[PDB]
């Protein structure tokens, strides 16, 4: 059978699968009261995409569609009638939680809407509209094919083909950014459907290992970081999709190796459903050498005891 | 090690010159264009060139620390650059500019984010719309600095800052020119470390491009801001991973429809990392949604393609 492999990519050559920015570090922590059930960056080791996961970083937290006016509303002054980010038509009966790439965190997404081009004489960046897309709005119903746009800078024109380019998140006085609380993809109208399952270490002494990025925060979190943590980088998702190598067990043993020295820094379990655990207790940011990378070692027995990750 | 292409349809490819999807394949004669883009440059055996790196999220993005440029009515601040990864940048590095630097003349538009501000400061107050114009005397990424023109919100000096690209802009005196390279060290100095210009040399051939429409936040009313790349980012990354030795100057590739099993057309993928087709005229290709290129065989530079 086709052997399973990982791409050979260092920490600085990986992209967050939940927001279009580079991975900055590996980070482990206990779940505590978080339900870890993100919908972007979900893929099995044999290449089955799940949740709202698709292949392009440029589609993650991006939206496309046609605007419609939303009169009588001080927050969502317009709505965006959605397609898939590819431009392909979207049907709410599609077996997805929401259009692929839809944000998978509760709170406010900030970015720029672009629409019909305007003349040079109209002025600077007049076809760039700063907007908030809040999941706590009753208009956040991407499953049903529509989201609310709250304008901050420049007027959004109704009735134009429009693209939303994400820039970061925001926290206002009553809308905390909660990366592990899923949106209600159908708002008040229906329960979420078609979800990739929640994940947890169930193994003694183990914790999830995350690929961590700091997302820009355009309002709030002064002196704090808006972290977004993914289970797989986009490049791993895409690799597994390409390869479709059959999984020979529940767990692939993987090792973080330094090719300069030839040494293994630590080992981890890569689970068939597409997530990583390490042997460690406590919240801990890993320090890895710049040229280091994970490599597939072997398929292991499900009760395999990892060498402690350590400091 | 055998050479291969990734199996990816037209809607599963990313422009290597701006972080947006490829929309179509397009061929045209060079005419007076010098085709020498610096992003999306990679040999078939996996050698990155120009300002090319692996992450779409780094293309036309900048990172660094801001410094005040008081009294300049265009660039009110500068950005002292690192590599987009955050790694320190030195002008003596053997690159045309920091990896991912824009490789077109004109105005790049996007949003600068800096130190987080309190919730009570107001909506999107840590988001600064800015123009980065290559025709500014402050556009000198090779020497580690670029000019930021704030559209309205105030950019703070002395803060760690990220620029996220959104699109291009055209104002009254700054046309968007995708095949004119910036002066990476400003207008007094010559560009260095450039990936070479490419052109068709066999009779009846033209370059084939992976074409996208970039958002344009000012100008080009009723027109499209095209950005055309020689290789999608996914092909660059694939060749980098594989590092398969090239067995000849040209890889024959065929665009196939897996639903019907038929070949729609064939093309030459050159070892230096660009494609030619047999056609004369500006022409947007129509390809089936599920179609993709596949590697056929190694041939030489003289192979005569079936007309597209
Ligand atoms: C800026 C602000 O604080 N606005 C308050 C409302 O909260 C925003 O409402 C919108 C939707 O309109 C969106 O959820 C934002 O994220 C909020 O910040 C607030 O609206 C009320 O609370 C919301 C959560 C939502 O349930 C909405 O339907 C409801 O009317 C109102 C009322 O408390 O006050 C506004 O100042
Ligand atoms: C908005 C506008 O049209 N401004 C004119 C200036 O052009 C801009 O200059 C800045 C740099 O300061 C930048 O290049 C922009 O892209 C331009 O649009 C214009 O400046 C002159 O022309 C430039 C091309 C540049 O060479 C600059 O150094 C030069 O002074 C001035 C003066 O002609 O008029 C403005 O209206």
TrEMBL record, chain A:
Q: What superkingdom does the record give?
A: Viruses
Q: Which residues form the Calicivirus coat protein C-terminal domain?
A: 82-311
Q: Which GO terms describe its cellular component?
A: host cell cytoplasm; virion component
Keywords attached to this Swiss-Prot or TrEMBL record, sorted alphabetically, are: Host cytoplasm, Virion
Record keywords: Chaperone included?
A: no
Q: Does the keyword Cell wall biogenesis/degradation apply?
A: no
Main location per the UniProt record: host cell
Q: What are the subcellular locations of this protein?
A: Host cytoplasm; Virion
Protein name per its UniProtKB record: Major capsid protein VP1
Annotated organism of origin: Norovirus Hu/GII.13/10N4598/2010/NP
């Amino acid at each position: 059978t086709k052997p399973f492999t990982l791409p050979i990519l260092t920490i600085s050559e990986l992209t967050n699968s939940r927001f279009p920015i580079p991975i900055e570090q590996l980070y482990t922590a206990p779940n505590e009261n978080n339900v870890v059930q993100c919908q972007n960056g979900r893929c099995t080791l044999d290449g089955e995409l799940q949740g709202t996961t698709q292949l392009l970083s440029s589609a993650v937290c991006s939206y496309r569609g046609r605007t419609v006016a939303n009169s009588g509303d001080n927050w969502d002054q317009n709505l965006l009638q959605l397609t898939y980010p590819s431009g392909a038509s979207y049907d709410p009966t599609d077996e997805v939680p929401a259009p692929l790439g839809t944000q998978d965190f509760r709170g406010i997404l900030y970015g720029v809407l672009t629409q019909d081009n305007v003349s040079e004489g109209t002025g600077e960046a007049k076809n760039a509209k700063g907007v908030y897309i809040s999941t706590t709005s009753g208009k956040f119903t991407p499953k049903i094919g529509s989201i609310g746009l709250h304008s901050i800078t420049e007027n959004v024109h109704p009735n134009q083909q429009s693209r939303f380019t994400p820039v970061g998140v925001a926290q206002n006085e009553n809308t905390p950014f909660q990366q592990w609380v899923l949106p209600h993809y159908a708002g008040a109208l229906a329960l979420n459907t078609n979800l990739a399952p929640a994940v947890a270490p169930t193994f003694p002494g183990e914790q999830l290992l995350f690929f961590r990025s700091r997302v820009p925060c355009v309002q709030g979190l002064r002196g704090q970081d808006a972290f977004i943590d993914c289970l797989l980088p986009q490049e791993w998702v895409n690799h597994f999709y390409q390869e479709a190598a059959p999984s020979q067990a529940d767990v692939a043993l993987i090792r973080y190796v330094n090719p300069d020295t030839g040494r293994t820094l630590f080992e981890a379990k890569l689970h068939r459903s597409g997530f990583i655990t390490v042997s460690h207790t406590g919240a801990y940011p890993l320090v890895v050498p710049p040229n280091g990378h994970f490599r597939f070692d072997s398929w292991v027995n499900q009760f395999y005891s990892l060498a402690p990750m350590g400091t």
